[PDB]
Symmetry: D2
Subunit: 353 residues, 4 copies
């Protein structure tokens, strides 16, 4: 059964529930919780497993809100945070001990597009009886079947919808039905009540209920509507990014094109094993910081902005926004949209001259 | 300036507009709109309390707010002390140097107990502890919380029926936040705005209970008619509580506006009206069930503070019903109750 | 049973239907049709009764869109329009002949606040077997029970809702169950199919369906929500206007205060007979056009604008906007809102000095 | 520039934005968004025709569009002449000096008859009569109507399920409007914009089929994925019509993309794809009913052009079903049809 047909034909709060049922139908999951934002999904998954006196392990590649959750909020709830290089399975193994209640990471880092080996990391952590929680925003369900790679809990930010009145956001939390929850002292009391639903039960009836990141039915409705054309939009988006990365290799003025679909990518093999397509974000450089700025000022379709995964193609210089130390001032990050490929190539050519 | 006037004449422009309206209505230092009532309560608490601290609250909580204090906060290493908030001495003895706030509601549910806010603010302020109050039962038109010493006001916003929910966090500009180790580090960056700065840029941003612009628009629309709806609703509830005293099959009417109510004086000092919820009993559980089955306007349901009048049996006496009084003309409410007897 | 309780407890397109049922419950009508706008209600009522070769009679007090419908659109469908002074029952009687399929007017004219005698005019037209169609926007159902005054068809513009994205509008068409439709050759074929529902049947299944002024369920939902607080808002609004008109009489700088609730009003008796309150619009003058402008520039709550029946109090000089010949350049029209009366008095005092 | 690019990169700002998108997608002189498809058709007609005029349209209308031409327009003193639009001679003989437009659809329903637009535009232009076409079956991504001589394009917008509806009126910048007595008086004020000026400031303003900003926002969102959804939908329908030819229990498949279709050549000349609706029969009415009862994905319903695939029996053969093909993966559509046989 295809993705688009599963978004369309699913086998109190009826709009939110209907969204949750779609998402479950789309992933084959044990169950799903829709929440008010991506940060709310992340923090709900963590706070379901971790409490004062525990630790958690995560990537040292976080910034902005996700970073601040781990640097400021979690230590205020008595949770020790261990930052590690998630590219290194041995550093991950050594950071984990009996206080460690989960490993959290992202499917593709931003802006470097590093791709951790999820299955390998799932095994390192499963051997110690620790669950794996992954933010799959860069590679949502049509691109990734996280259950096959050992991912216990999948979290993501939902399709955003921008209006005059502000941006409508959401989050999604997915239990893949992999981890034996009853083996954790955190969830054993909920196993008595809910059986295999122990994680989802605490997450929903306790953590979500008490911290209250409610999802509006109006947002839920828009997100369901988005799920209908997700496969179609992602196919377009991701084929455009794959073709752009390849074509960028032919442009004299362009250097250091980075996308995991390219054969010279360090993450070429792992991406091909994990993903239908390695997401719709790529990176590249011109000769200098100043050539990159002049290029960007000259684009007529692709716009400068902060968001990613818009229908519109968007670009920015991650350096100008502030480890920064490891990124080139001449690097630009391109979030590729659903425009016809010929127009995007044409805009980029034109902005070069 | 009147309340209605101030609701009407004052990134995320709809949410910000809602926040400015609420700040105008309240005269507050500042205001944060959030995805729900629970988000507002938990955001206020987690701005002040962290692992190794304690908090004091009323022993009259149930449902979600109770589960936050029984399960979620002790998991964050926060010790919760439950006390009888009717007793200012027990409140005093529960607070020590670890205690980072007192939390309570303005009118308890379903008993309608009214704590003496100004008396409790003094007990807690005398130890350098802020007062955080859920004013859902008595929102801004009914209560000026800052006059009673309330540092942080929290409430559930007007719901719109899925159901669109919200919450509101209000800093009344009372507590000197730089004197607190929890906020002194923000004081450099935000001055008097240090509570709001932490709450918005750290706790809210990281736990993510985002308020939808669509909910925010509706709640703004709602604020315009708030004074008008609360007047009607609260005069109806006052009148009905009185009138109920005259009905031979009715016993034990409870509302703080009744002279014989234990909370008569405290409610009169604190509130324009003591909320739109009242309680009463018939002869017995069975007479109460028959009465409710026979109602044609007032409907049985769980929600409170709807435009529609709603009733339920909380079982506290098994014969007790709780009536959330709505904005229907008083004559039809009286008539439906009579007919159902 | 009170108005507010009838808006709350009503005894395909479920949101639109629910609105229609509320409105019927609020008016005691035979039936109701909700439409995309006020102009759509007006034109639907007219085009249900009138066709090429017929005439219609209406007030000579129309302007803007309503006027343009009668001056340009209706004559293009072969309908003769006869404009008359509706203050004059004898001019009305003489304008009507066997080709005349309805009399259309408004409950209170704008900006002059003239109040035609509806019951008298209903009798003039009923005697000739002609129905009466009335726009009751100035005096909607809580203020007026149009059936008691002989009004066959009540039409109105719905409560508007302004957002970033533009204004959401609607219209309402009400059959009061008064006229015997089967006596008209226009509606007799529909009487065969629908009985007493003949008017509503043609209006809905034909005129509305074929010209297509559809009402959005999103607008319908907002309008239903508005109906809940209509009585409360109108009571406030209308008491404010009544008290303002009275109080304005005490202000040295103020002249020619016009509102039908004032005893010296020419429409004092007819308004008291017809309305709970004579609407929330009043008019007054200062000494000169220039004193009026300086007053208006100095108001701090009451704002200059074109709309009326907002929650906010709004004012304008009808002269500056362009018969104009019969209106004073120093006259201002005040649409009174729901602000506390003390603030409105205070703003007006302040803007005078 | 591609279609998707143009949907994305272009008082009442949401409606105006929708209109600018549609103008970008079409290269038109201008565009009016309206409250429905019927509002768009009636607005185009009533801009051109008045009492004492005639109009010509196809004899293949039913439901609302048919009732407008049978009941509403003759009541406005407009004579309506119904003709076989497949026959350019009958079209010519129906037009005289009173005739102010020819109206038809791009693909008739349920027969799927495809009129030769460019041939009919010539017949009608040779008499100074504009061509007004409802392109609902073949919207802008599928058809560039201006190339085929179509003066005014009208269509129902993408619906969102109550149900939010819309319509669109498009002036392709082809007809010289000053040569017409109906519009010459606007030409002074509006120049080339005289059709649009009358339609918007007079007919639309006075009959009031206002488009909600909320519907308008959704339809804008919809336009962004229009090319993608129509590709999928129309390739599915092409493929299914072919594949249906191979199924022993299927007879009489109808789709203009089939070589044996009478409209094969005309559809290929006019359309990227000939719409997403096809027709077929089983052995008998009863076999057709059993088949439809047994479908698990494709649902019986009245709507067309949904994301979901929909089917019904229009009874034209009683055994005929009409399938509105949606955007499901082709394998699952094939599989549901097989399983149901």
């Amino acid at each position: 059964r295809g993705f688009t047909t599963r978004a369309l034909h699913v086998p109190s709060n009826p709009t939110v529930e209907d969204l949750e049922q779609r998402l479950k139908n789309l992933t084959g999951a044990l169950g799903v919780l829709a929440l008010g934002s991506g940060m709310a999904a992340i923090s709900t998954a963590i706070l379901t497993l971790a409490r004062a006196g525990d630790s958690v392990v995560t990537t040292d590649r976080l910034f902005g809100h996700t970073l601040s959750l781990f640097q400021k909020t979690l230590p205020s709830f008595g949770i020790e945070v261990r930052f590690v290089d998630v590219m290194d399975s041995l550093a991950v193994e050594h950071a984990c001990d009996e206080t460690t209640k989960l490993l959290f990471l992202e499917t593709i880092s931003n802006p470097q597009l590093q791709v951790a080996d999820l299955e390998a990391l799932s095994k390192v952590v499963h051997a110690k009886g620790i669950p794996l929680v992954v933010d799959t925003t860069m590679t949502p369900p049509y691109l990734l079947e996280a259950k096959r790679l050992g991912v216990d809990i999948e979290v993501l930010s939902s399709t955003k919808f921008i209006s005059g009145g502000g941006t409508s956001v959401g989050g999604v939390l997915i239990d893949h039905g992999l981890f034996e929850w009853k083996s954790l002292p955190s969830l054993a009391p909920y196993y008595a009540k809910a059986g295999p639903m122990a994680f989802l039960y605490k997450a929903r009836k306790e953590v979500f209920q008490n911290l209250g990141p409610s999802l509006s039915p109006h947002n839920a409705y828009l997100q369901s509507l988005g799920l209908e054309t997700m496969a179609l939009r992602i196919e377009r988006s991701c084929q455009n990014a794959q073709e752009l990365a390849h074509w960028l290799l032919s442009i004299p003025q362009v250097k250091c094109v980075n996308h995991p679909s390219l054969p010279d990518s360090p993450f070429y093999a792992i991406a091909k094993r994990q993903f239908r397509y390695a997401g719709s974000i790529l990176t590249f450089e011109l000769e200098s910081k100043e050539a990159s700025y002049r290029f960007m000022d000259a684009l007529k379709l692709i716009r400068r902005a902060t968001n990613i995964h818009d229908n519109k193609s968007l670009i920015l210089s991650p350096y100008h926004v502030i480890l920064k130390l490891e990124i080139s001032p001449a690097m630009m990050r391109l979030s590729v949209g659903i425009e016809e490929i010929e127009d995007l190539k044409e805009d980029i050519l034109q902005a070069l001259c």
